[PDB]
């Protein structure tokens, strides 16, 4: 998988593609179609991180994602495209509440 | 909101753009957005009087801590009123304390509080709220927290 987490507005923001820069997040779409049939995306990257992740997890309200990669955790302020925060991991739990970790 | 993107250089303002909604913060409304803290028109009388018509009570008996101070943090500060009738002052310690305290609530009528904090050496205490408005007596006892 890539690292992505989706806001229930309807944007799964992922980053990267497979090893592409993280530079590419977004997707609020704009339109509707049949179950079987297929759909269109928006285009407006944000990001161009360096650390290569393997986790994405949303904040409990989607909001703050903490992303880990290269073994450290960048958390983003997302809309912000701000680094919400960073450090090195080993293992994790968000305090589910959406306010601690 | 309907969220619209910008070009700050020179923009565009167009009918289209799509909504997303973001949850905002709570508003809590206080007992100090509404009140003018005062000194009484007639304390002696008023003091009693306010009892007369108005008065609700709560008692606690305090057995793990013998200090006002916690209480104190919630009360001077929450109500925003004046402690007193010469019954305010305490140094970095003090044996006993009463705040007989004042201000007036919105809608005109007043909200009045007497807090006799009593130290035996536990604290057991009589908090009175007396009011010239009904909604405040129930409120003070809560609000102070």
Swiss-Prot record, chain A:
Stretches forming WD repeats: 48-86
Oligomer and partners: Oligomeric complex that consists of at least the alpha, beta, beta', gamma, delta, epsilon and zeta subunits. Probably interacts with PEX11A. Interacts with SCYL1. Interacts with JAGN1.
Sequence similarity: Belongs to the WD repeat COPB2 family.
SS bond list: none
Gene knockout outcome: The knockout of the gene results in early embryonic lethality with no viable embryos recovered at 12.5 dpc.
Biological function: The coatomer is a cytosolic protein complex that binds to dilysine motifs and reversibly associates with Golgi non-clathrin-coated vesicles, which further mediate biosynthetic protein transport from the ER, via the Golgi up to the trans Golgi network. Coatomer complex is required for budding from Golgi membranes, and is essential for the retrograde Golgi-to-ER transport of dilysine-tagged proteins.
Cellular compartments annotated: Cytoplasm, Cytosol; Golgi apparatus membrane; Cytoplasmic vesicle, COPI-coated vesicle membrane
Protein name: Coatomer subunit beta'
Leader sequence residues: none
Domain of life: Eukaryota
UniProtKB/Swiss-Prot annotation, chain B:
Domain of life: Eukaryota
Subcellular location: Cytoplasm, Cytosol; Golgi apparatus membrane; Cytoplasmic vesicle, COPI-coated vesicle membrane
Family: Belongs to the COPG family.
Subunit structure of this chain's protein: Oligomeric complex that consists of at least the alpha, beta, beta', gamma, delta, epsilon and zeta subunits. Interacts with ZNF289/ARFGAP2 through its C-terminal appendage domain. Interacts with EGFR upon EGF treatment; interaction is essential for regulation of EGF-dependent nuclear transport of EGFR by retrograde trafficking from the Golgi to the ER. The coatomer interacts with KDEL receptors; the interaction is important for retrograde trafficking of KDEL-bearing proteins from the Golgi to the endoplasmic reticulum. Interacts with COPB1. Interacts with TMED10 (via C-terminus).
Record function comment: The coatomer is a cytosolic protein complex that binds to dilysine motifs and reversibly associates with Golgi non-clathrin-coated vesicles, which further mediate biosynthetic protein transport from the ER, via the Golgi up to the trans Golgi network. Coatomer complex is required for budding from Golgi membranes, and is essential for the retrograde Golgi-to-ER transport of dilysine-tagged proteins.
Protein name (database record): Coatomer subunit gamma-1
Gene coding for it: Copg1
Full-protein residues shown: 730 to 874 of 874
